[PDB]
Amino acid sequence: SATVNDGASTSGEGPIIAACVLQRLPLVRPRLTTGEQAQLALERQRALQTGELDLRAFDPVPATTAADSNGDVSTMRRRLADSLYLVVRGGPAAGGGGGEWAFPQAVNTAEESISDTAQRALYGAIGRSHPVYFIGNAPMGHVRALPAGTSFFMLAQVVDDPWDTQLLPGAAQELAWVTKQELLGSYLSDARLRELVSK
């Protein structure tokens, strides 16, 4: 992370946001269909064959929890078969519930650069509690809503983090945990950025 002594701070008059998204890795392997994979693996092992010519304390761990994923999106206990992404619902108007949505966002310093700003933003949203690692120093998507307020989408991932709602500084209201198949569940608030996150 290098910072130049001088630069044109065009992003001081324009609120370009150093906003980062937490892409969680899915912990365990998703279950593939046993019948078709078993038939295919049987075919490949037949081809391999013809080509060459604690005990009471161990339980196989279940990969499913009773609570479903849709609707309740509070904590990390829903889908180990799919990636989940931290989506912050946009904050209230005066200190109550949320209306339109947003992302975990923080506007950049006019001098200090975007990616380290987003790493600091998701570093101070845990309140110096647990280390959260980062993926890339370059943004993934571009924002067409405001040409001055174009948010730069950096990416990060989960190591271990029990989150609190009262520590995200991008006007936090709630926490949403969804997959790329359902990143458009907030269509009433998001207009066209939800189409650009589909890449």
Binding site: A2, S11, S113, M140, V159
Partner: protein, 91 residues
């Protein structure tokens, strides 16, 4: 007679690979068209994944142009922090 080493190397040379334990499988075209599907799975999966990577490459190429040179300098730093090893893979 034979020592333990001699019986060991006999059962070891004989079972370096297990010696011919397979029925030789023939194939005649009175089947279903499956090898077409077998190439289709891998071709479609690898091509969709590499299209995703090339589109991501296009976005990361076009990302860093509406922004001044210090933002390039943070964007064009070619080093990475070592990975924290606490990222357990697909179990």
């Amino acid at each position: 007679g034979v020592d333990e080493e001699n019986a060991r190397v006999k059962a070891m040379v004989a079972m370096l690979q297990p010696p011919a334990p397979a029925e030789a499988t023939p194939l005649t075209p009175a089947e279903q068209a499956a090898a077409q599907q077998l190439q289709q799975q891998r071709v479609a999966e690898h091509q969709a994944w590499v299209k995703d990577m090339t589109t991501k490459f296009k976005l990361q190429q076009a990302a860093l142009r509406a922004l001044p040179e210090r933002l390039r300098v943070l964007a064009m730093q070619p080093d990475h922090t070592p990975y924290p090893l606490n990222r357990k893979f697909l179990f």
